[PDB]
Ligand binder design. Sequence first.
Ligand SMILES: Nc1ncnc2[nH]cnc12
Ligand SMILES: Nc1ncnc2[nH]cnc12
Lengths: 338, 338
Amino acid sequence: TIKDVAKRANVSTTTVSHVINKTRFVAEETRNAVWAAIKELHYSPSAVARSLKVNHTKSIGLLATSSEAAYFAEIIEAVEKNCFQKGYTLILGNAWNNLEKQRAYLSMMAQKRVDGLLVMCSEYPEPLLAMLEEYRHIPMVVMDWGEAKADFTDAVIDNAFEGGYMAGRYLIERGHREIGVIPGPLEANTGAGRLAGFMKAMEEAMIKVPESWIVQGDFEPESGYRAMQQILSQPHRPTAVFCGGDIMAMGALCAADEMGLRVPQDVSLIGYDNVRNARYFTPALTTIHQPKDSLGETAFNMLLDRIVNKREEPQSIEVHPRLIERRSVADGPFRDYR
Amino acid sequence: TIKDVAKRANVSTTTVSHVINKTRFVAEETRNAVWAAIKELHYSPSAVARSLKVNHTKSIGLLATSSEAAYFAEIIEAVEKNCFQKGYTLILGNAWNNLEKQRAYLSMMAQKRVDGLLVMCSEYPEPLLAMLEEYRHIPMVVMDWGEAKADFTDAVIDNAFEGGYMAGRYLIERGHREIGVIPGPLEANTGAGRLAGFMKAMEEAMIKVPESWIVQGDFEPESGYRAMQQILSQPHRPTAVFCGGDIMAMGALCAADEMGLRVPQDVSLIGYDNVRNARYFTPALTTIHQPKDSLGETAFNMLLDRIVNKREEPQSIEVHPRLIERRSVADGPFRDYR
DNA sequence: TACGCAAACGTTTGCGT
DNA sequence: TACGCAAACGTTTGCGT
Ligand SMILES: Nc1ncnc2[nH]cnc12
Ligand SMILES: Nc1ncnc2[nH]cnc12
């Protein structure tokens, strides 16, 4: 079809190609004609032909876990924005934590020859780490590790641990000593790490978390629902709860309300993530905010680097969580005694 | 690189290609060797080379509005699932209702030669309809029109109007006669259409909606916040409110609570969409459910058709909303008198 | 039997002059 | 000056025998 353009214009396809890509000077007259042709002929330059030669698709692959989750969903929108402003095309892939599925998308991806890979799989078993390595040749960054599990990738790190600690400290400083916790999956960083950061501050204040007071969630609202329930559904109950993720907290809030408990009046609750509409939870959610937009742009940027400035060395950037006081926490029994 | 495989194997690339695609019988011995080579050499068959010849990318483009919105986000996850099971790759694009951006993604798309196009732009001005047509050659379906605006596309239709009517009828049948409404953008179907379906049932019952009682939203929680506020912030206030979308309702719920109003005790509220976690709103949201998973798979299926069975004729499939009784509505003053 | 040779897909880019 | 000829990117697929 470039041939068809070249001819309506009576110039070489070499010419057409030069004007289309402004890769060398061309007589105005010449240029104009080409355009004209380009027009009537209604021409769409084929990227597949072009990638074939130039050796890059100008497309990036996001191997995510799920895209419905508020959390994820906001990161993704971030990455896309960046791709679109620097000309990259985004191929989105949800593997749902299924190895098979993962082996599958990873491969469809190498085959489509994406220029780089954005990895966000939540959990990383050796079997997965292993697969990841087989594509070390394709540039990539894992946006969700705690530390740097590997040497064949870039990593953006969230300091989930320090978020966990911040959360606990707030509770402590508000007068709370009987606290509970619904962590997210321990196999995940945002799960295990947030919890641990939380457990430290407790030890620091000699608070002890009765196991009957910690209930695993899975970042889904229903998990929050059940957890809270189970917590308050007991003889002795905490006065404050740390919830591993906003959406689960949303669930925690519903159950309380359903048991006729008042928040923060009966139970104080603090979450984590600061999802776009946590401010509109009822009551307005007090949480630890995770820089999602920056977590995304930061990742996109390391990749581009590696892509463009052909980097070889693994890199890692830290990002920082911060506390957001809203209205779901109230002073606890010891506020006055400090 | 296929050449490199062919040689480690001492067979023709024609052979390699045949075994890789099982396109003709090959001696086990032969086959095996090829694999062997395929292995050590660590081979990734290039899809770009292949698409170049076979003429299809086996990739589909979703030109959406935004992917953060709960609503959207759930549809998208649906479409992706379908793509992944039928081998298609999903290229996601958010145009945010910006023509320019739209002209941009549309073009990057034709150029990447996607096999088909999934359109979900919320609002369709002639200028946009116009652009869309210039790509009538690429197969596509618009998943969000009310009626069939064009002849050069497939359309999946939601019956938003009948959702609107259902909503109103419920309110009426619960004893409500003083109702308010926060519609979504009138330029959009889910906006204008839901409202109109709602206005009909009103006329039918001779209920009259005082303009001071209808406040436009934009599907975003803050719009709900402000609207509700403005509604209840007045001398005379309705006893029930129809909210154009769940997320806005979420906002409506927050404000009420903030003015110390009780739901549904002081104000009854009913939304629309039945987003994944409306059940966990406080209180559990009563809403009209939009079949999102089916809205997605249905769209993917018309496209595949057109793609595969090379259809030419425009088609349209209707989908149906349905009411979900949760706990945000209470009987109104006239319940007993019917 | 079971497999090869060679042209083609639509570009970009080196040398020409 | 301002532009062309022709080879190459990595495949698939028609005919061969
Ligand atoms: N895996 C996860 N899923 C959903 N929200 C999250 N927030 C932090 N980690 C998350
Ligand atoms: N345009 C839109 N945005 C967000 N949620 C919606 N639900 C219905 N239409 C919507």
